[PDB]
Amino acid sequence: MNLNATILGQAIAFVLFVLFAMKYVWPPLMAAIEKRQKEIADGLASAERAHK
Amino acid sequence: DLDLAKASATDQLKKAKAEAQVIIEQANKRRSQILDEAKAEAEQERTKIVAQ
């Protein structure tokens, strides 16, 4: 419809959210599931090495 | 699997270490038996031949 300077304030909000999420949000997540997979895999690897 | 592997390794090591020692010791026993038998029977034969 009608364009307005709302185009700019939301451009501030978007970059702020992106910076904060990129820094703090993502790195802590996805660690736990990877730890689960690595635990299963390394337990299997160690048990099979001892089996050999 | 780790527990079974360590237990089996210790069991087989102990068993082989015992059995090989037993075999070699009884081989020494057999050698000594043969030596004693020969040593006795030599003089037994000589004592027969002199009476002959």
mmCIF file with all atom_site columns, N, CA, C and O in Angstrom, chain A residues 3-22:
data_model
loop_
_atom_site.group_PDB
_atom_site.id
_atom_site.type_symbol
_atom_site.label_atom_id
_atom_site.label_alt_id
_atom_site.label_comp_id
_atom_site.label_asym_id
_atom_site.label_entity_id
_atom_site.label_seq_id
_atom_site.pdbx_PDB_ins_code
_atom_site.Cartn_x
_atom_site.Cartn_y
_atom_site.Cartn_z
_atom_site.occupancy
_atom_site.B_iso_or_equiv
_atom_site.pdbx_formal_charge
_atom_site.auth_seq_id
_atom_site.auth_comp_id
_atom_site.auth_asym_id
_atom_site.auth_atom_id
_atom_site.pdbx_PDB_model_num
ATOM 1  N N  . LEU A 1 3  ? 4.067  3.170   1.328  1.00 0.00 ? 3  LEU A N  1
ATOM 2  C CA . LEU A 1 3  ? 5.388  3.052   1.930  1.00 0.00 ? 3  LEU A CA 1
ATOM 3  C C  . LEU A 1 3  ? 5.593  4.132   2.984  1.00 0.00 ? 3  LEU A C  1
ATOM 4  O O  . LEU A 1 3  ? 5.011  5.218   2.906  1.00 0.00 ? 3  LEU A O  1
ATOM 5  N N  . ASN A 1 4  ? 6.426  3.832   3.977  1.00 0.00 ? 4  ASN A N  1
ATOM 6  C CA . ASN A 1 4  ? 6.653  4.755   5.083  1.00 0.00 ? 4  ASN A CA 1
ATOM 7  C C  . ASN A 1 4  ? 8.012  4.457   5.704  1.00 0.00 ? 4  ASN A C  1
ATOM 8  O O  . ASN A 1 4  ? 8.622  3.415   5.450  1.00 0.00 ? 4  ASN A O  1
ATOM 9  N N  . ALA A 1 5  ? 8.473  5.392   6.540  1.00 0.00 ? 5  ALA A N  1
ATOM 10 C CA . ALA A 1 5  ? 9.723  5.240   7.272  1.00 0.00 ? 5  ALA A CA 1
ATOM 11 C C  . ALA A 1 5  ? 9.722  4.048   8.221  1.00 0.00 ? 5  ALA A C  1
ATOM 12 O O  . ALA A 1 5  ? 10.745 3.791   8.865  1.00 0.00 ? 5  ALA A O  1
ATOM 13 N N  . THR A 1 6  ? 8.604  3.324   8.334  1.00 0.00 ? 6  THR A N  1
ATOM 14 C CA . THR A 1 6  ? 8.622  2.042   9.027  1.00 0.00 ? 6  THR A CA 1
ATOM 15 C C  . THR A 1 6  ? 9.630  1.098   8.383  1.00 0.00 ? 6  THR A C  1
ATOM 16 O O  . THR A 1 6  ? 10.121 0.170   9.037  1.00 0.00 ? 6  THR A O  1
ATOM 17 N N  . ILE A 1 7  ? 9.947  1.329   7.106  1.00 0.00 ? 7  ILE A N  1
ATOM 18 C CA . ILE A 1 7  ? 10.940 0.542   6.387  1.00 0.00 ? 7  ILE A CA 1
ATOM 19 C C  . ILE A 1 7  ? 12.302 0.608   7.072  1.00 0.00 ? 7  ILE A C  1
ATOM 20 O O  . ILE A 1 7  ? 13.114 -0.318  6.944  1.00 0.00 ? 7  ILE A O  1
ATOM 21 N N  . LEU A 1 8  ? 12.575 1.683   7.807  1.00 0.00 ? 8  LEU A N  1
ATOM 22 C CA . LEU A 1 8  ? 13.877 1.888   8.433  1.00 0.00 ? 8  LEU A CA 1
ATOM 23 C C  . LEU A 1 8  ? 13.940 1.346   9.858  1.00 0.00 ? 8  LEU A C  1
ATOM 24 O O  . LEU A 1 8  ? 14.910 0.669   10.222 1.00 0.00 ? 8  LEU A O  1
ATOM 25 N N  . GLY A 1 9  ? 12.926 1.644   10.677 1.00 0.00 ? 9  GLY A N  1
ATOM 26 C CA . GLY A 1 9  ? 12.909 1.129   12.037 1.00 0.00 ? 9  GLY A CA 1
ATOM 27 C C  . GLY A 1 9  ? 12.921 -0.387  12.087 1.00 0.00 ? 9  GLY A C  1
ATOM 28 O O  . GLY A 1 9  ? 13.598 -0.989  12.928 1.00 0.00 ? 9  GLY A O  1
ATOM 29 N N  . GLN A 1 10 ? 12.170 -1.030  11.192 1.00 0.00 ? 10 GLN A N  1
ATOM 30 C CA . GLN A 1 10 ? 12.233 -2.481  11.119 1.00 0.00 ? 10 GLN A CA 1
ATOM 31 C C  . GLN A 1 10 ? 13.577 -2.961  10.593 1.00 0.00 ? 10 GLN A C  1
ATOM 32 O O  . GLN A 1 10 ? 14.007 -4.060  10.954 1.00 0.00 ? 10 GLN A O  1
ATOM 33 N N  . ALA A 1 11 ? 14.261 -2.157  9.775  1.00 0.00 ? 11 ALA A N  1
ATOM 34 C CA . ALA A 1 11 ? 15.616 -2.504  9.367  1.00 0.00 ? 11 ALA A CA 1
ATOM 35 C C  . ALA A 1 11 ? 16.597 -2.440  10.530 1.00 0.00 ? 11 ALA A C  1
ATOM 36 O O  . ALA A 1 11 ? 17.578 -3.190  10.541 1.00 0.00 ? 11 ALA A O  1
ATOM 37 N N  . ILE A 1 12 ? 16.346 -1.568  11.505 1.00 0.00 ? 12 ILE A N  1
ATOM 38 C CA . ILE A 1 12 ? 17.137 -1.564  12.732 1.00 0.00 ? 12 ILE A CA 1
ATOM 39 C C  . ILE A 1 12 ? 16.813 -2.789  13.582 1.00 0.00 ? 12 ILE A C  1
ATOM 40 O O  . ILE A 1 12 ? 17.713 -3.480  14.082 1.00 0.00 ? 12 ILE A O  1
ATOM 41 N N  . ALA A 1 13 ? 15.517 -3.069  13.756 1.00 0.00 ? 13 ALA A N  1
ATOM 42 C CA . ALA A 1 13 ? 15.095 -4.197  14.584 1.00 0.00 ? 13 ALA A CA 1
ATOM 43 C C  . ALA A 1 13 ? 15.625 -5.515  14.033 1.00 0.00 ? 13 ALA A C  1
ATOM 44 O O  . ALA A 1 13 ? 16.071 -6.382  14.792 1.00 0.00 ? 13 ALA A O  1
ATOM 45 N N  . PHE A 1 14 ? 15.587 -5.673  12.709 1.00 0.00 ? 14 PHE A N  1
ATOM 46 C CA . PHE A 1 14 ? 16.015 -6.911  12.074 1.00 0.00 ? 14 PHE A CA 1
ATOM 47 C C  . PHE A 1 14 ? 17.501 -7.160  12.299 1.00 0.00 ? 14 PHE A C  1
ATOM 48 O O  . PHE A 1 14 ? 17.899 -8.260  12.692 1.00 0.00 ? 14 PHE A O  1
ATOM 49 N N  . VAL A 1 15 ? 18.338 -6.152  12.042 1.00 0.00 ? 15 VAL A N  1
ATOM 50 C CA . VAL A 1 15 ? 19.777 -6.318  12.229 1.00 0.00 ? 15 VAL A CA 1
ATOM 51 C C  . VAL A 1 15 ? 20.102 -6.574  13.698 1.00 0.00 ? 15 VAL A C  1
ATOM 52 O O  . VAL A 1 15 ? 20.976 -7.389  14.022 1.00 0.00 ? 15 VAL A O  1
ATOM 53 N N  . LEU A 1 16 ? 19.411 -5.882  14.613 1.00 0.00 ? 16 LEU A N  1
ATOM 54 C CA . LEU A 1 16 ? 19.662 -6.120  16.034 1.00 0.00 ? 16 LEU A CA 1
ATOM 55 C C  . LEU A 1 16 ? 19.324 -7.552  16.424 1.00 0.00 ? 16 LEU A C  1
ATOM 56 O O  . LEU A 1 16 ? 20.109 -8.222  17.114 1.00 0.00 ? 16 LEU A O  1
ATOM 57 N N  . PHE A 1 17 ? 18.173 -8.048  15.960 1.00 0.00 ? 17 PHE A N  1
ATOM 58 C CA . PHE A 1 17 ? 17.789 -9.425  16.253 1.00 0.00 ? 17 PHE A CA 1
ATOM 59 C C  . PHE A 1 17 ? 18.773 -10.407 15.646 1.00 0.00 ? 17 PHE A C  1
ATOM 60 O O  . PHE A 1 17 ? 19.122 -11.402 16.281 1.00 0.00 ? 17 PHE A O  1
ATOM 61 N N  . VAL A 1 18 ? 19.239 -10.122 14.430 1.00 0.00 ? 18 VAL A N  1
ATOM 62 C CA . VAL A 1 18 ? 20.165 -11.012 13.751 1.00 0.00 ? 18 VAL A CA 1
ATOM 63 C C  . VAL A 1 18 ? 21.484 -11.084 14.507 1.00 0.00 ? 18 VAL A C  1
ATOM 64 O O  . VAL A 1 18 ? 22.023 -12.172 14.738 1.00 0.00 ? 18 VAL A O  1
ATOM 65 N N  . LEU A 1 19 ? 22.012 -9.934  14.921 1.00 0.00 ? 19 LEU A N  1
ATOM 66 C CA . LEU A 1 19 ? 23.271 -9.915  15.660 1.00 0.00 ? 19 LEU A CA 1
ATOM 67 C C  . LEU A 1 19 ? 23.144 -10.667 16.978 1.00 0.00 ? 19 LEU A C  1
ATOM 68 O O  . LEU A 1 19 ? 23.990 -11.510 17.314 1.00 0.00 ? 19 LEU A O  1
ATOM 69 N N  . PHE A 1 20 ? 22.087 -10.375 17.740 1.00 0.00 ? 20 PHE A N  1
ATOM 70 C CA . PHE A 1 20 ? 21.938 -11.015 19.043 1.00 0.00 ? 20 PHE A CA 1
ATOM 71 C C  . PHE A 1 20 ? 21.745 -12.520 18.903 1.00 0.00 ? 20 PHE A C  1
ATOM 72 O O  . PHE A 1 20 ? 22.355 -13.302 19.646 1.00 0.00 ? 20 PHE A O  1
ATOM 73 N N  . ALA A 1 21 ? 20.925 -12.949 17.941 1.00 0.00 ? 21 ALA A N  1
ATOM 74 C CA . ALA A 1 21 ? 20.707 -14.373 17.745 1.00 0.00 ? 21 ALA A CA 1
ATOM 75 C C  . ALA A 1 21 ? 21.976 -15.069 17.273 1.00 0.00 ? 21 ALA A C  1
ATOM 76 O O  . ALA A 1 21 ? 22.337 -16.127 17.802 1.00 0.00 ? 21 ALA A O  1
ATOM 77 N N  . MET A 1 22 ? 22.693 -14.462 16.324 1.00 0.00 ? 22 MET A N  1
ATOM 78 C CA . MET A 1 22 ? 23.917 -15.058 15.808 1.00 0.00 ? 22 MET A CA 1
ATOM 79 C C  . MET A 1 22 ? 24.934 -15.253 16.923 1.00 0.00 ? 22 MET A C  1
ATOM 80 O O  . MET A 1 22 ? 25.525 -16.330 17.053 1.00 0.00 ? 22 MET A O  1
#
